[PDB]
Amino acid sequence: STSDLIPAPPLSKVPLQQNFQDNQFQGKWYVVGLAGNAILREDKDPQKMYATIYELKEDKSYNVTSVLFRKKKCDYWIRTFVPGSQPGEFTLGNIKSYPGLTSYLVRVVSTNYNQHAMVFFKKVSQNREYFKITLYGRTKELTSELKENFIRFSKSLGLPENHIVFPVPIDQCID
Ligand code: CM2
């Protein structure tokens, strides 16, 4: 391996949603926008929308399930997000069970809980530092104002246009 990556931005460029409400953030969210240093536009085979479901467990950790449509099937990915240093931040539970992963951070940047959200993730895997930002929607469509905003924020973190995509709405699996 030889890879080049846009550097993760310093945490100080990533706002935190104030007064984060874990109970209201629960439920299903669609990924209407996706940006990151390992995210690449692929005009030939554009990326399909997928969904991520947050369920609060009794201990207040989230059970996180992502579902995507691939090879005619629904693929499910499950992880645990445990509360971090402040409300709206999380780290990954059982980091141990993933070979090569030494750090994982989740920070809710902003959300109104019933329509949209922007979430920043940063991780270190096989010693490479990765980051992405998701534009989450309670519905598969969001105003063009929210999309531009997500675009400005992604760029403010060093990401150019070809590292920012808007997955295509589908009906399979995510409904
Ligand atoms: O996207 C969300 O809404 C939030 C997430 C919650 C669930 C956790 C799924 C588990 C692990 C994981 O997510 Fe992934 O998550 C990241 C977190 C922080 C920084 C960068 C990334 C990623 N992930 C993407 C990626 O390409 N990962 C690798 C390496 C794959 C294993 C490590 N990654 O990279 C890969 O080859 O994946 C193939 C594509 C695929 O289907 N994977 C999807 C799985 C479902 C959620 C979307 N996603 O985010 C994917 O990776 C690109 O940047």
Curated annotation (Swiss-Prot):
List of residues binding enterobactin: Y104, K132
UniProt name for this protein: Neutrophil gelatinase-associated lipocalin
Function according to Swiss-Prot or TrEMBL: Iron-trafficking protein involved in multiple processes such as apoptosis, innate immunity and renal development. Binds iron through association with 2,3-dihydroxybenzoic acid (2,3-DHBA), a siderophore that shares structural similarities with bacterial enterobactin, and delivers or removes iron from the cell, depending on the context. Iron-bound form (holo-24p3) is internalized following binding to the SLC22A17 (24p3R) receptor, leading to release of iron and subsequent increase of intracellular iron concentration.
Induction per the UniProt record: Expression is activated by the oncoprotein BCR-ABL; BCR-ABL misregulates expression via the JAK/STAT pathway and binding of STAT5A to the promoter. Induced by insulin.
Subunit description: Monomer. Homodimer; disulfide-linked. Heterodimer; disulfide-linked with MMP9.
Recorded coiled-coil stretches: none
GO biological process, one term: positive regulation of cell projection organization
Any one Pfam family match given in the protein's UniProt record, by short name: Lipocalin
Entry-listed glycosylation sites: N63
Keyword entries, A-Z: Apoptosis, Cytoplasmic vesicle, Disulfide bond, Glycoprotein, Immunity, Innate immunity, Ion transport, Iron, Iron transport, Pyrrolidone carboxylic acid, Secreted, Signal, Transport
UniProt family annotation: Belongs to the calycin superfamily. Lipocalin family.
A GO term, aspect molecular function: enterobactin binding
